[PDB]
A paper describes a structure:
The Streptococcus pyogenes bacterium secretes the protease IdeS and the glycosidase EndoS, which specifically catalyse cleavage and deglycosylation of human IgG, respectively. We present crystal structures of both enzymes in complex with their IgG1 Fc substrate, which was achieved using Fc engineering to disfavour preferential Fc crystallisation. We show that mutation of IgG Fc residue E382, which consistently forms salt bridge interactions in Fc crystal structures, can be used as a strategy to discourage Fc self-crystallisation and thus promote crystallisation of protein complexes.
We identified residue E382, which forms salt bridges with R255 in a neighbouring Fc molecule (and vice versa), in both Fc chains. We hypothesised that replacement of this residue would hinder the self-association of the Fc into this preferred crystal lattice, and therefore designed three IgG1 Fc variants: E382R, E382S and E382A, which we collectively term as “Fx” variants. In contrast, the E382S variant produced 9 hits in total, all of which were in JCSG-plus™; this variant therefore displayed a ~57 % reduction in crystallisation compared to the wild-type Fc. Crystals of the Fc E382S variant were found to have grown in an atypical space group P3221. As of August 2022, this space group has not previously been reported for a human apo IgG Fc structure; we did, however, find examples of IgG Fc crystallised in complex with a small peptide (for example, PDB 5DVK36) where the reported space group was P3221. Analysis of the crystal contacts revealed that this variant makes fewer interactions with symmetry-related molecules in the crystal (four salt bridges and sixteen hydrogen bonds), which are asymmetrical across the two Fc chains, resulting in altered crystal packing. Furthermore, as calculated within the ccp4i2 interface, the E382S variant had a higher solvent content and Matthews coefficient compared to the wild-type Fc, indicating that the molecules are less tightly packed in this crystal form. We conclude that crystallisation of this Fc variant has been rendered less favourable; this indicates that other substitutions at E382, as in the E382R and E382A variants, would have similarly altered crystallisation.
Numbering used by the authors:
A (entry chain A): 237 to 444
B (entry chain B): 237 to 445
Write the structure that this text describes.
């Protein structure tokens, strides 16, 4: 009955020293008469301790949903250590195990280019500011937009796309009002990747 | 046990008269002692019998992967008929069914914009010509690149991405040699969509010194 789902830390957390990367180990479909679940975590085969098991979250479909969280070190994740979650329950015949780690492969540095709107789009009510990010490996990346320190949240980013070489690329599109573009406001495409210098770069975009 | 995944026809196939739109019905995780799969197709509740079941594709994880394909008519897809795939197998307690159709909703016309390389990229050996396609619904679209009549095939396109409004967008990236860009050659982003005037539009891109 019980199923297991081991999720990696958010890319933004693994690349920012201030944040705390967490590996979460979701267990679903737990019965009422077999409610006890027990986790064991391993890091390259080495038992680790002091995980945090959140309280049982009783579901709409008359089951439980237990979650155990393990905070991992920034360096250990980015060095590519394998984190294993061993679930044990009465309903299970044999303990389930899942393993997760950073996408293995030679890290490659993204080139970040900003592209302004076409003059055809300038006739429209709003305009699209484009940020090309290309040549990065692996596909674990985070792209954000901002003006000054204050962030812009009216943007979408495309899934990473595998190129002719081993690398990836993507586009991020910030939609702004035409007025604010023509007033000469500065927008900044911030990118975060493991292969970037200090895990961060930022390119600006303005009217000439 | 067995899982089912019903996929729509390639957007390029539904929009080109010469091509053949197909609905594929993938069945995964089939055991060795229950290898027989049997499909039944329906079009708005009407049984059809013109499918082709491909041979079992034995997987790396000691299971099979059976696929049944149904060719659909261009007009039937674009009119929005519902295609259903009913899988049956020993391992299943009750036959599984999945349904797919064209995304129902007011069709919206893509705006097509071409963007030249940044001057930072101009230092590199090759440069990237960008084609933004935005504001289209549904997500059935096809993008090609060309110079003159002859096509350019060194390009990649992103999956359609859902925007803040109901519409979609995507980017297509043509990689060309820096020389050919600076010689002032004209490249053309051709787009094909249900909502486009005559199901086709094309925007050009050049050095424009
Ligand atoms: C044994 O191996 C096989 C083979 O797997 C392959 O080989 C192994 C060795 C590994 O390397 C695998 O990584 C590799 O894939 C396993 O078979 C796989 O089984 C899983 C399910 O367990 C299937 O997952 C689904 O995948 C589809 C997307 O699949 C397309 O894209 C894949 C790459 O991205 C590609 O590999 C596939 O072939 C397929 O590509 C399409 O193929 C068709 C025909 O081949 C073609 O016409 C198309 O053009 C082509 N398109 C593209 C884009 O490539 C994904 O959509 C599914 O997601 C749904 O279901 C999930 C539940 O599993 C759920 O979590 C998701 O959220 C999602 O659910 C849907 O969500 C929408 C939201 O709007 C909702 O509306 C829907 O109702 C909802 N549906 C459901 C059912 O919930 C899903 O992830 C793999 O496709 C399949 N792989 C292959 C190649 O067949 C097998 O499982 C292994 N067995 C064991 C025991 O381990
Ligand atoms: C009772 O209800 C439970 C609650 O779930 C919700 O409601 C039910 C009714 C359904 O509608 C659910 O789909 C819905 O989620 C059920 O639990 C769910 O079980 C299913 C199947 O066992 C799980 O499916 C798996 O989902 C994975 C992704 O999971 C993330 O995203 C989900 C939403 O998109 C979210 O519900 C999950 O909690 C989880 O969220 C992430 O959590 C981490 C922290 O742990 C965060 O860091 C992320 O940011 C979160 N992200 C998001 C988007 O929220 C899939 O990855 C997984 O697919 C993989 O495994 C399968 C094999 O199973 C492969 O085939 C596949 O290729 C892939 O590798 C799978 O689809 C679902 O996630 C569970 N939901 C929750 C909340 O735990 C109970 O099952 C249900 N019980 C019964 C008896 O019906």
């Amino acid at each position: 009955g019980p199923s297991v789902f081991l999720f990696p830390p958010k890319p933004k957390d693994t690349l920012m020293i201030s944040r705390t990367p967490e590996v979460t180990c979701v267990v679903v479909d737990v019965s009422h008469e077999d409610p006890e679940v027990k986790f064991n975590w391993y890091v390259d085969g080495v038992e680790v301790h002091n995980a945090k098991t959140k309280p049982r979250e009783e579901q709409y479909n008359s089951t439980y949903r237990v979650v155990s969280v393990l905070t991992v070190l920034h360096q250990d994740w980015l060095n590519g250590k394998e984190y294993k979650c061993k679930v044990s329950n009465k309903a299970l015949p044999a303990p389930i195990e899942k393993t997760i780690s950073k996408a293995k492969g030679q890290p490659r540095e993204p080139q970040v280019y900003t592209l302004p709107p076409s003059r055809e789009e300038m006739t429209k009510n709003q305009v699209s500011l484009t940020c090309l990010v290309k040549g990065f490996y692996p596909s674990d990346i985070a792209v954000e937009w901002s003006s000054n320190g204050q962030p812009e949240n009216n943007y979408k980013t495309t899934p990473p796309v595998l190129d002719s070489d081993g690398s990836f690329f993507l586009y991020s599109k910030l939609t702004v009002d035409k007025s604010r573009w023509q007033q000469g406001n500065v927008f900044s495409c911030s990118v975060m990747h493991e292969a970037l210098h200090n895990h961060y770069t930022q390119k600006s975009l303005s009217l000439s």
